[PDB]
Amino acid sequence: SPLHFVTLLGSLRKASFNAAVARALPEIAPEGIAITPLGSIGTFPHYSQDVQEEGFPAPVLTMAQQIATADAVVIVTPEYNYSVPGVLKNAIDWLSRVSPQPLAGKPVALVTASPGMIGGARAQNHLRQSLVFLDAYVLNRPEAMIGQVTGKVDAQTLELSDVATREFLARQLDALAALARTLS
Amino acid sequence: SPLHFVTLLGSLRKASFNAAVARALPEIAPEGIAITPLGSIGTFPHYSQDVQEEGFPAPVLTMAQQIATADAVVIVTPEYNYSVPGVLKNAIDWLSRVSPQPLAGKPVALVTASPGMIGGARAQNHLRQSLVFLDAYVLNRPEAMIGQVTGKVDAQTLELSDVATREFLARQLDALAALARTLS
Amino acid sequence: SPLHFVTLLGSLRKASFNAAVARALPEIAPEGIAITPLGSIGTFPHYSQDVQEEGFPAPVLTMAQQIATADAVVIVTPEYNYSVPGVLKNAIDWLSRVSPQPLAGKPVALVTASPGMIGGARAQNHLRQSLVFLDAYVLNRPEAMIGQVTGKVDAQTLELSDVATREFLARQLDALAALARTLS
Amino acid sequence: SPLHFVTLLGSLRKASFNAAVARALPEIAPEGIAITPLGSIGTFPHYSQDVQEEGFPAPVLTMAQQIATADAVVIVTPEYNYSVPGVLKNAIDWLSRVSPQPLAGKPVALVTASPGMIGGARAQNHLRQSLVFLDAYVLNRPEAMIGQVTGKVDAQTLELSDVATREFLARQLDALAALARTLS
Amino acid sequence: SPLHFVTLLGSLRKASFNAAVARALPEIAPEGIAITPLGSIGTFPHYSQDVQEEGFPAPVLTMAQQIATADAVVIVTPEYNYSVPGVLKNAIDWLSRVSPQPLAGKPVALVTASPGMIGGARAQNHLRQSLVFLDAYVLNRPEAMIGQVTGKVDAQTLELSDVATREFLARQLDALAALARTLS
Amino acid sequence: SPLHFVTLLGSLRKASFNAAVARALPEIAPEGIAITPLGSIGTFPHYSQDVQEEGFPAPVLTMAQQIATADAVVIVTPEYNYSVPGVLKNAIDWLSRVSPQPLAGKPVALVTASPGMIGGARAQNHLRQSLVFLDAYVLNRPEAMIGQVTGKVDAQTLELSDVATREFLARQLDALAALARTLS
Amino acid sequence: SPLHFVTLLGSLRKASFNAAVARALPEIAPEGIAITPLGSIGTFPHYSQDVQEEGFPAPVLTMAQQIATADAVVIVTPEYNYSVPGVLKNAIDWLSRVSPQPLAGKPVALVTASPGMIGGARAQNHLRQSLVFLDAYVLNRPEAMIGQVTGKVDAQTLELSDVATREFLARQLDALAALARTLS
């Protein structure tokens, strides 16, 4: 029984280090697991109940259904101002309003990449808190906070080059897989 | 010593209860305090370093300047998914990248309104964490979590009518003024 | 498959509302679930590595083993100063140092009873954060924050009397059972 | 303008790295600032309202009075299980019940030391949350999380020798002094 | 005519302030100047003529070659015991024995970061003395001694944040480029 | 009082002229002075605070204790690139980090041998500067700079034969003894 | 037992900060120590061996004798062009040619004052090197480099007013006293 994971990306910039990490996941994916990226969160309008009343934005409904059929979600995001990027939270806000809400019962792993050293622990904390409210099953272990990322992805070639980082992400995907199969 | 406060609104919908509360603040304001609304957070694009490199969106600079010259800020916002609305966080994210950063040293009070009963305590917690990182001085007391907001503003007429709520908010404004004058 | 749950109590006072709730759990327990109380957290000394080196206090080892053999744990606790009571956190600190650590992989539900309206949301938040680190599986839903408890447990008789509350707790226990069996 | 700060220590063990940091603060203190240690939190019994009715434990009243008369408090603590040590929280719980409550309006700085890399960020977050409730004024910047403390204090001799750490802490103490003088 | 500078780092610890400064140089570099880090000095064995007779260690030849193709070298190092760190001096010792010797005629700028007020000036003195022997052309002005570095790079995030320091360094790089072009 | 001197050797090579000088010292030594070599500096790893975090290398602690218990130290070293060899400096860097630091108050004599004519005068200068920081008492006179050392030790037999040098070294050892007894 | 210290001043201008420091020494002097100024270095002619043949200049023989009979010398001097002022070096040059040479075996403490931040570290270094040649015993610790001296002396009123500076110089004088007596 092959697993299907989808990735949600929390940064919009082209040279995003988190995007590099996200793009690496399908090549890193251990046997039995296929991984594909979701559409951009940049296509969502700002959440507004008035907009919702008129109808859900198409990219929102598309993403929700993509999450619904997936075996798990991997969220890869930077940390802004000791919390989750507003753009990413905005995507979560829209998704949370869909019926049925696609994150309920969904296995989720969190990954954060940062040039520094804390590696996004606070964004992950806040993100987990929302995901508990949405009844998601967020992987406890191993925690994926990737520090000093600037020297772990190669400039010009966009790709995550750190071999140690790649192996770590593979172990996290395996644990996420185990969680998904346990909950099924 | 006359103070000028500005208000930041965390909801975009026309019938927003938090908008109703924000509009009451300038009439409610104790003497010696004038209060004006900031522009809408809905005019901001999603944060992206690429957009920033090209130049700060005009509404971002306008808001940063109004905050810089104000003596204090009142943030009035709902709670989405046990945290701050993505849209509001996105505005904070944009403001945080301005030089000089307008919230540094700024006295701030938080107000949350909810139809529910917790009344937005969780959004205020996460907001406070971000504001500390941005070196703002956020009012400790009194805390303003307005629950059961449905019966405190009259529908059709948009306005906050509950006299006890008004009197409480005036008193929070007093504490904010006192905090501002202490730090000056 | 009959399940056995144990209860961990976060308040030391005799007239504790949280104690009333904890005592109600074994009679409330649905068919197939038996519930027994752990020893008091008041018998633990303050955590100290110096004390630990000399040897683990007996009640710590006794509690750890009762948790290890249990199918799930229910923590019933008040909220002090927007967080977990120090005494309860102290018990968790001791448990976390036992090998093997008894909360790893353990299903846990959180319950808070309070005179207020927030009903211990902040304590449960902080507690969840610690339990995540300890690799516990904490029930997402339903959340058990019992507000206005003064009229829900009767004075003179010490016991939880509100029938609606009892029925709620039964359903939470049912959800905890389902989580435990899913993870088994 | 001579200031007096008191230090509250969150670890009980003899060889505590945080104790080593706390002992260094008075010699590190910039001109105009004297710093003295509070009594041990290990002398407090577990918080219980039943005990409180009988009377506040003497060491609790002694510490509350030293805090009340101090110009500021520096809390130095490790992080246990992604939060504040139970014993330390227990001390805060006791202090919070004294009248008048000694931390209200008190300038406070936080210091955490850890063998890891995070250096106690999570403990400081939870501590800040409690301190808001108690109306303390906790220093926003600079934040003192001392990671890899093992190579910063020399074993066998108990003392903080790392010159970079000392300079950082002195600058934090300068900022606390400024906060204290501003609020006075 | 685009220039390529390489950086030589004199400290081995991960949380090194000098490394933080070294990492900032390529983003700081004015247009027409690209800056890349050399390999670690930690891979060199201790210098020994006996080892040399057997053959030059690979990382030595690799570094010498990278220096050779570079238009200039920036040496970024702390000061140990009023002088140059032995590990760095050891790398210079190895390089000085390569034929042809890569630093002869090479433009060199020196940068030192330190907690003190001296800012690593003594290390720069001794370093200059060795470089004269190696016939390097070391920039006279501006001299870059970054004192009180603890308040100039952010703890937790590894990054050089002091804006005045960054511009000062950009100015040194301009002066280094000018020196290089004069000799070219 | 049979004084005990220890010798620290700055060259790692088998045929070292400085090693030849160091080995000559105990036979040159007047009655009442025993001279023994310290362990090799080649056994030290490169200094790193990260390595220190995990623990001081055993040979570092051994050398520190032997220096600490010795009545005086004789440092015998070549000069590399107008300064002290990196390997030797690396050993000093490690010793300086030991508590208590073994060179404090320690009588020290410097001996340098070189094929050239300067005879290691520049190395002694830099070494003295470090030794000032480490609070050592280094012998002013007589200064032992052995130039043209190739013709002062006989090939094939490794031994220091130049009668003028031996007599000179003997007088230096006497002065070192006199200094040691004076400081007692 | 009574000590007599003499001060040698390295600056000739009336509003000299070092002159201010020099005048403070006899009142700052701890008990058992009297401090008197030497004559001015400005009365010495430029050194010349031809002039020396005719006879040593009178102020030189006078200074040499005052130093010889003194228990220790305190040299207070600015730093010129990263080194010792030529005038002061000239006075040293003259003293060095006297028989017997007055600085041999003499305890010396160095003090430098500067409006800047380095505070004369480079001058003290060069001075030390010369004094080694002259067999002086120069105090290793504490080092007295007084930076930002402009606010440490009150202008127009001539005298050193910074209390922290006075106490520090007092401590150096104590160490100089201890050094002299050990060597006795």
Next chain:
Amino acid sequence: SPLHFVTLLGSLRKASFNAAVARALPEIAPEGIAITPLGSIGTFPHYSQDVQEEGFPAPVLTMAQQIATADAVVIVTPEYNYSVPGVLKNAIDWLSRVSPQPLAGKPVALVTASPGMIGGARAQNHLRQSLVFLDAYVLNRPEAMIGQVTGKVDAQTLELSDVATREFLARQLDALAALARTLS
């Protein structure tokens, strides 16, 4: 394109070996290079800011102008007390205060003569440190330390006779020429 060099003499005595070396330079000078002596440093008064305020001494202004107009400077000096003669340093001190300062950007070569074996290496070191501060471009190679000078200049006739030394000095002037033209 003919170059003009000026010579600065560091000894005042009639029979100075360094003077003999200085006088030989114009005859040794290769075609395309003419060399003239500066005025004597003995005509300078001791540096004093009080004197400077009244006006720069005539010889200072004269020497500054000749250095400013020269293509390079050759400094010929003995070494006193392991450093530069005070009188020479005094001339430099005076020059350093003129605007514009004449040594800035000036190519400089150093020549030292001594009867010993070190050959003035220490004076050249210290001289270089000051000249770097004054932004001079000091020749790295070849280095001219004329040791064993007594038999290299003949008494009775005042002249520098050592043919190898003369050739060495000729090569240095060419290197000095090449340096000057590179910087032009």
